[PDB]
């Protein structure tokens, strides 16, 4: 703490696992179509596009402090319910969705 | 897709009569060949059902769904099993005064193996 | 036999093609069999349900045929020259594959047939058609899943063969070929250095003695 | 310095190429399969980079063009096509999203008009930046209108059939030479944008 | 054009692209089944064999006129619509085909 | 000069094999899978050649044999078999037609019966030029009759079932001595021709 | 001697890893997956062997533990289970019997109790020979009775609802002291045998 937060470790687990699943979902979408896809895969897809286009993407002269990064992370993960978030302690999950 | 809008019947006389009244089948006005086949139970040879089977599935193409009685379908078991196409659909329903049997149902056998 | 000098690059991409196919095709297979199971339980029930309805409508029609003292069915066969209940076909994407679905229409431009007015026997046929049109509608609406089912049954069998084929044959062929070429390849680079070192040793001897 | 690199043993794993890529900041691809098919010079966005890009698109912004915006979309159309092609080869087509089909189609247009040209474009003796920008601008506008059009509801097929006249017109672009508008800005391409907008109107409703 | 024809270079360019697709379609045909085939590809599979066994084949003693060669090229290409062609300028095509 | 060579590299691309392959006139390959089943010496048409065959076949034609026509038909039966065999393993035999189903089967018989020359007899090890001809003739007559019969209306399974005994008799033919009939041209092979012809009438109808 | 080996060329085909596996008679696999799941070490019976095993268990057999019999039966249950999982994937659970479902449960226990550790208690931190022995004795004891009872007219669902308290107790043994029965022979197990027998009377009836 004091250059990180406590909630840093749990989040690192949620975002990596969800992201991986997001890549797998993109391939499945191309095959099944948009009007025949799963709910769980649909969520994973939405996450892939936002994750890429907000978390990873930053501007040339835009500084991303670690505290700043962690907030953007909660917006992305929010789309999943609490039921699908679980590599996060319920303590954290209740603080920040 | 759409190129077929008759439902053909292989069934006992009463069941068929009823179905026609309700309006599903017809006797065509330019072929003059029935698009249904009535059956007198036990009084009609197994060979005549088979000609009629070929007729709805292959020699006709305006047949959407092929309805067939479990009692009758069993007699000509070989021909039904060998038919595996979806054009027309094969849907076996119980015969009159006969109960369900999974083994007079060609499709159910097929599905069970190789699941 | 396959090229020795830097096949590695193409052969690696072959592996990546293969790999992508196992995961994706397995997801696709997984999803089709998950659906297949759902249909299975529906179709099984629907067979029993159609049978009960068909036997009950058939018995009411039979009673009537016998009471009037003439066989209605002969009368009925002349008059049938159209069908009220027909189907209209649609292709529906259930996963990537197109299955046949049907949606039923009742022609309102189609009048009642004339098999009534027979006297007391005519009342009996008139009540009879009304139960039967209701009954017959059942058989067709339930039947729409069957055609989709049969197709689903054929396609899953093909998709199942493809996963097994890429997994067992294709991927290990890419491994073994890559390896064969690797082993020759590293040795061409190594032996050269040894050849150089052997010639240079002779050279150092001559030069040193001067 | 334009220095040609080519094989000295392997395809790119030869010493020459390995060293040169290290030091070069601009690399423009050339695929062999497309070469035999006659679609050279073929530039592949995975086998191509420019490190000069950021200073260069800001230079072209000063010159007049919107250029940096067109670059990102040009990249996106080529980029998704390669991944969707890999699903096409293995699985096949029995389904391929409404959006995904559009990307493939438009990427063909880009191949044919740009990538293929070497004695096949009757004007090629010197092509201005504005004209390139104007041509690509029509392609990208056709793309965004098309993907919106399937989503707000309208079949993919109705959308191909109605776009019709303009679609051919972008297909034919490559032969056209500055002869309308300015000396570098071409009217047939400027006309094209507005007609495109009218096609979208017919196509959505 | 004075000892060949102007279409000599165009008609050659068409035949490479079609032959190339036919060859990839063949490889795919073995592995997956006829599931990855498409209308153009089925046509391309036939083209491959047609070309191989009529065009390339000839007796040891046999010799061939270049102008002759060019009519046999056109013939093979006649089984494809013209809208699918693109390695030939539409002017050139119209004259000799 | 007949010379055996071997790898020591576990490939066929090694110097020893390569330098001989360059120079050699006739090449008799080695297919490890067939040999694993035992078929000494083991070959396919795709791994072997003789540049000398043409001039040899005209010479054999004078001698009695129908040899030229049989050389072209032999290559063709093996070559088709190889392509179809990949399709069967990966995709299924479902795509294949009954004539091509036959192609695998006649070809299998040729593998077991020809290639295998280890024997436990000198009749299963020595096959005279005449004995080799009769055998090949008998087997092609089967294949041609077989593709026709299924064509005008018969099955691969049904056809297989009718020849049945007559198929075993051609398999076991090889064991029989060559010193009988006219010389090695037996009456045993000549009668067999008639029985194939008869079988053809049954099979079709 | 315990030596770690790792890729030396980015492959496991490195001379080192392959040379040492030859010399050693013990091989114990290690996985990323089991470590993320919090099983430390990570040894499975598919990625391991020990040929020293016959002599060791024999040694153990002397002291008090029934070790040799128990251990062979443990390896087999984990092996047989893997195969039964593959069916769950393809067909599903509508082609598996009560007896196959039972194999899965026992296997889950073996894995849970032995393989998964993380220092949960000062009972995972150190375990004697005796506690290891009591754990497997309990799992096999349940396995034979349970399968026997489904053969005699019972259901996996039935076995599950009645077993309840005794079954959770064997799963949790790893958190509790082994010092309950004596001082290093565990009482939580010794009482279990009697309850499991009693359990089975109720289950059959």
mmCIF file of N, CA and C in Angstrom, chain E residues 26-66:
data_model
loop_
_atom_site.group_PDB
_atom_site.id
_atom_site.type_symbol
_atom_site.label_atom_id
_atom_site.label_comp_id
_atom_site.label_asym_id
_atom_site.label_seq_id
_atom_site.Cartn_x
_atom_site.Cartn_y
_atom_site.Cartn_z
ATOM 1 N N UNK E 26 -7.853 -28.174 -53.073
ATOM 2 C CA UNK E 26 -7.549 -29.618 -53.081
ATOM 3 C C UNK E 26 -7.031 -30.143 -51.731
ATOM 4 N N UNK E 27 -6.150 -29.374 -51.093
ATOM 5 C CA UNK E 27 -5.460 -29.741 -49.838
ATOM 6 C C UNK E 27 -6.484 -29.771 -48.696
ATOM 7 N N UNK E 28 -7.360 -28.702 -48.690
ATOM 8 C CA UNK E 28 -8.424 -28.479 -47.718
ATOM 9 C C UNK E 28 -9.498 -29.559 -47.847
ATOM 10 N N UNK E 29 -9.725 -30.033 -49.112
ATOM 11 C CA UNK E 29 -10.715 -30.971 -49.546
ATOM 12 C C UNK E 29 -10.383 -32.228 -48.815
ATOM 13 N N UNK E 30 -9.092 -32.605 -48.747
ATOM 14 C CA UNK E 30 -8.755 -33.859 -48.056
ATOM 15 C C UNK E 30 -9.034 -33.915 -46.596
ATOM 16 N N UNK E 31 -8.717 -32.829 -45.837
ATOM 17 C CA UNK E 31 -8.639 -32.773 -44.411
ATOM 18 C C UNK E 31 -10.003 -32.697 -43.766
ATOM 19 N N UNK E 32 -10.753 -31.638 -44.077
ATOM 20 C CA UNK E 32 -12.016 -31.289 -43.424
ATOM 21 C C UNK E 32 -13.287 -31.949 -43.964
ATOM 22 N N UNK E 33 -13.280 -32.100 -45.308
ATOM 23 C CA UNK E 33 -14.323 -32.687 -46.041
ATOM 24 C C UNK E 33 -14.711 -31.673 -47.001
ATOM 25 N N UNK E 34 -15.912 -31.725 -47.548
ATOM 26 C CA UNK E 34 -16.438 -30.829 -48.624
ATOM 27 C C UNK E 34 -17.229 -29.693 -47.996
ATOM 28 N N UNK E 35 -16.861 -29.288 -46.766
ATOM 29 C CA UNK E 35 -17.556 -28.436 -45.861
ATOM 30 C C UNK E 35 -17.040 -27.066 -46.058
ATOM 31 N N UNK E 36 -15.688 -26.917 -46.390
ATOM 32 C CA UNK E 36 -14.935 -25.703 -46.623
ATOM 33 C C UNK E 36 -14.997 -25.306 -48.098
ATOM 34 N N UNK E 37 -15.645 -26.121 -48.932
ATOM 35 C CA UNK E 37 -15.801 -25.793 -50.352
ATOM 36 C C UNK E 37 -16.858 -24.735 -50.517
ATOM 37 N N UNK E 38 -16.739 -24.002 -51.691
ATOM 38 C CA UNK E 38 -17.566 -22.876 -51.985
ATOM 39 C C UNK E 38 -17.696 -23.026 -53.486
ATOM 40 N N UNK E 39 -18.585 -22.203 -54.189
ATOM 41 C CA UNK E 39 -18.866 -22.394 -55.602
ATOM 42 C C UNK E 39 -17.682 -22.235 -56.450
ATOM 43 N N UNK E 40 -16.888 -21.180 -56.234
ATOM 44 C CA UNK E 40 -15.663 -20.847 -57.000
ATOM 45 C C UNK E 40 -14.702 -22.015 -56.844
ATOM 46 N N UNK E 41 -14.571 -22.632 -55.654
ATOM 47 C CA UNK E 41 -13.558 -23.641 -55.358
ATOM 48 C C UNK E 41 -13.817 -24.953 -56.104
ATOM 49 N N UNK E 42 -15.036 -25.427 -56.190
ATOM 50 C CA UNK E 42 -15.510 -26.607 -56.941
ATOM 51 C C UNK E 42 -15.233 -26.528 -58.403
ATOM 52 N N UNK E 43 -15.438 -25.338 -58.924
ATOM 53 C CA UNK E 43 -15.072 -24.953 -60.283
ATOM 54 C C UNK E 43 -13.591 -24.976 -60.426
ATOM 55 N N UNK E 44 -12.818 -24.511 -59.389
ATOM 56 C CA UNK E 44 -11.391 -24.464 -59.428
ATOM 57 C C UNK E 44 -10.809 -25.859 -59.397
ATOM 58 N N UNK E 45 -11.372 -26.830 -58.674
ATOM 59 C CA UNK E 45 -10.947 -28.219 -58.611
ATOM 60 C C UNK E 45 -10.994 -28.900 -59.955
ATOM 61 N N UNK E 46 -12.098 -28.635 -60.762
ATOM 62 C CA UNK E 46 -12.203 -29.150 -62.076
ATOM 63 C C UNK E 46 -11.197 -28.571 -63.021
ATOM 64 N N UNK E 47 -10.936 -27.246 -62.853
ATOM 65 C CA UNK E 47 -10.046 -26.429 -63.708
ATOM 66 C C UNK E 47 -8.713 -27.026 -63.658
ATOM 67 N N UNK E 48 -8.231 -27.471 -62.411
ATOM 68 C CA UNK E 48 -6.909 -27.981 -62.164
ATOM 69 C C UNK E 48 -6.629 -29.184 -63.034
ATOM 70 N N UNK E 49 -7.546 -30.106 -63.120
ATOM 71 C CA UNK E 49 -7.416 -31.340 -63.802
ATOM 72 C C UNK E 49 -7.501 -31.176 -65.293
ATOM 73 N N UNK E 50 -8.327 -30.206 -65.659
ATOM 74 C CA UNK E 50 -8.617 -29.906 -67.050
ATOM 75 C C UNK E 50 -7.372 -29.393 -67.719
ATOM 76 N N UNK E 51 -6.717 -28.511 -66.981
ATOM 77 C CA UNK E 51 -5.504 -27.826 -67.381
ATOM 78 C C UNK E 51 -4.372 -28.831 -67.417
ATOM 79 N N UNK E 52 -4.278 -29.658 -66.375
ATOM 80 C CA UNK E 52 -3.202 -30.564 -66.272
ATOM 81 C C UNK E 52 -3.153 -31.541 -67.348
ATOM 82 N N UNK E 53 -4.325 -32.062 -67.816
ATOM 83 C CA UNK E 53 -4.349 -33.212 -68.648
ATOM 84 C C UNK E 53 -4.574 -32.924 -70.079
ATOM 85 N N UNK E 54 -4.877 -31.660 -70.470
ATOM 86 C CA UNK E 54 -5.146 -31.294 -71.870
ATOM 87 C C UNK E 54 -4.033 -30.390 -72.210
ATOM 88 N N UNK E 55 -3.759 -29.307 -71.363
ATOM 89 C CA UNK E 55 -2.837 -28.190 -71.705
ATOM 90 C C UNK E 55 -1.385 -28.603 -71.654
ATOM 91 N N UNK E 56 -0.989 -29.214 -70.503
ATOM 92 C CA UNK E 56 0.404 -29.402 -70.219
ATOM 93 C C UNK E 56 0.892 -30.565 -71.015
ATOM 94 N N UNK E 57 0.077 -31.700 -71.182
ATOM 95 C CA UNK E 57 0.297 -32.957 -71.915
ATOM 96 C C UNK E 57 0.488 -32.794 -73.390
ATOM 97 N N UNK E 58 1.489 -33.474 -73.994
ATOM 98 C CA UNK E 58 1.630 -33.506 -75.484
ATOM 99 C C UNK E 58 2.740 -34.557 -75.710
ATOM 100 N N UNK E 59 2.863 -35.078 -76.986
ATOM 101 C CA UNK E 59 3.786 -36.100 -77.396
ATOM 102 C C UNK E 59 5.160 -35.557 -77.396
ATOM 103 N N UNK E 60 6.229 -36.390 -77.403
ATOM 104 C CA UNK E 60 7.577 -35.970 -77.521
ATOM 105 C C UNK E 60 7.833 -35.260 -78.844
ATOM 106 N N UNK E 61 7.263 -35.866 -79.931
ATOM 107 C CA UNK E 61 7.456 -35.368 -81.281
ATOM 108 C C UNK E 61 6.635 -34.116 -81.578
ATOM 109 N N UNK E 62 5.641 -33.840 -80.673
ATOM 110 C CA UNK E 62 4.720 -32.793 -80.903
ATOM 111 C C UNK E 62 5.413 -31.501 -80.630
ATOM 112 N N UNK E 63 5.056 -30.459 -81.441
ATOM 113 C CA UNK E 63 5.455 -29.102 -81.262
ATOM 114 C C UNK E 63 4.303 -28.215 -81.446
ATOM 115 N N UNK E 64 4.311 -27.006 -80.883
ATOM 116 C CA UNK E 64 3.147 -26.139 -80.784
ATOM 117 C C UNK E 64 3.344 -24.717 -81.223
ATOM 118 N N UNK E 65 2.370 -24.239 -82.065
ATOM 119 C CA UNK E 65 2.231 -22.803 -82.441
ATOM 120 C C UNK E 65 1.866 -21.884 -81.252
ATOM 121 N N UNK E 66 2.501 -20.669 -80.986
ATOM 122 C CA UNK E 66 2.163 -19.813 -79.825
ATOM 123 C C UNK E 66 0.748 -19.300 -79.902
#
